Amino acid sequence: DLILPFYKAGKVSFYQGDLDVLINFLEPDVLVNAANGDLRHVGGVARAIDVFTGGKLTKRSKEYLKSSKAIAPGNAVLFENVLEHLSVLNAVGPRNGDSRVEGKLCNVYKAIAKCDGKILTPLISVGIFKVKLEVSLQCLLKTVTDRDLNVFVYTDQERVTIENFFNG
Ligand SMILES: O=P(O)(O)OC[C@@H](O)CO
Numbered sequence: 001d002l003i004l005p006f007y008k009a010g011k012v013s014f015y016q017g018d019l020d021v022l023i024n025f026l027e028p029d030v031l032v033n034a035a036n037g038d039l040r041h042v043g044g045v046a047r048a049i050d051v052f053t054g055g056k057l058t059k060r061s062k063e064y065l066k067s068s069k070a071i072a073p074g075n076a077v078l079f080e081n082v083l084e085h086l087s088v089l090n091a092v093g094p095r096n097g098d099s100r101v102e103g104k105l106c107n108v109y110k111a112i113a114k115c116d117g118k119i120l121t122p123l124i125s126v127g128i129f130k131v132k133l134e135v136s137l138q139c140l141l142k143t144v145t146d147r148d149l150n151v152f153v154y155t156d157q158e159r160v161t162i163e164n165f166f167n168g
């Protein structure tokens with residue numbers, strides 16, 4: 001109620017604050033990570049998420065990668081209870097100029113959609129992966145059509161660009 005998304009489109013809400021406050025206020029069950037393929041969270045949003053978990057995310061990721069194949073853009077694996085009652089799914093998105101940049105992204109959002117509970121997710125493969133926002137948003141917006149979802153908006157730019165993208 002008393003922290004309001006700066007924009008709501010359908011069942012989808014957009015919040016730009018810092019991660020602690022938001023996660024604390026929204027009480028999500030799954031937090032989505034804009035992930036590597038090899039789960040190295042060295043900057044951007046995945047860095048934040050990791051710190052947020054006191055690095056427990058990284059810890060789990062390494063282990064994960066010693067009995068499991070790296071992650072193909074277009075997919076996601078969920079780590080349950082990374083912190084108590086908080087799960088992270090690492091969704092790897094496409095880098096700008098792979099094949100089916102679009103159909104990959106879509107699957108990601110599709111995976112994100114199937115998760116149970118309240119979700120908070122950054123906009124996918126839109127940072128150092130360099131896919132333009134219009135596309136990711138468009139994918140997400142198009143793919144997850146009937147589900148409450150909370151997009152974490154990570155920077156002032158992400159914000160402006162999202163503003164434009166809703167020009168009515
Ligand atoms: O997928 P994006 O959002 O572009 O970021 C990749 C990131 O995991 C590198 O640290």
Ligand SMILES: [Cl-]
Nearest residue numbers: 043044045047
């Ligand atoms: Cl950064």
